[PDB]
Amino acid sequence: AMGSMERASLIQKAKLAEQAERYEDMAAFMKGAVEKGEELSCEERNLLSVAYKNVVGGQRAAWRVLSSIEQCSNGPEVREYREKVETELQGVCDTVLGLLDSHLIKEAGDAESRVFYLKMKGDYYRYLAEVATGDDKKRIIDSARSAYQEAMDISKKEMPPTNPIRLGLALNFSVFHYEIANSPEEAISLAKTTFDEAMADLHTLSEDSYKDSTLIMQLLRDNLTLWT
């Protein structure tokens, strides 16, 4: 599909699509780039994440609108169209999970790449869990938790407490606990420990690293304000 296009041209077109706010295009360019089989640089991993974040973010917001309407109603149309949007969302999550399993994660040896991809695996199972019902929901939740836990274990061993990758993983795992796993205390404990550990490490940073880390710390704080 993007098999005939040069890797470098796919990356170039992904950045153009980002400028144009054409996130479905950007995601398809980045899927093509991944399927070239080469590992992704830091910049390229960020392009991949931004593209699919935006695509699934749209689908999630739409699914929430439709599910709200369907709940209020409780003919077949609202259910039918919520299911169409749900299926397309699951498809996008399955596509991203597929890229990570074939073969991004297994080739990723450095902590910055491995933690990034395992956080992504956690996040896309987490979006699957948001629309899942029943027992099915359990196995998906456990997949998300496992991915996030492996990423946390590597990040705590390999990265400083202020590393933005590590801080963003902890932010999302804390949201997983509060919103998916019905564990608001675990969510608050994680976000509070993560914030306090980063605070203590800020003195080590340059002005630009300080701004990157404090930005994500503020997100942990905003959640802690919401949750306490």
């Binding site: 973010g57 996040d123 963003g168 932010l171 999302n172 509060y178 919103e179 997100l219 959640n223 919401l226």
Partner: peptide, 4 residues
């Protein structure tokens, strides 16, 4: 409440 997640990143981004």
């Amino acid at each position: 409440g997640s990143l981004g």
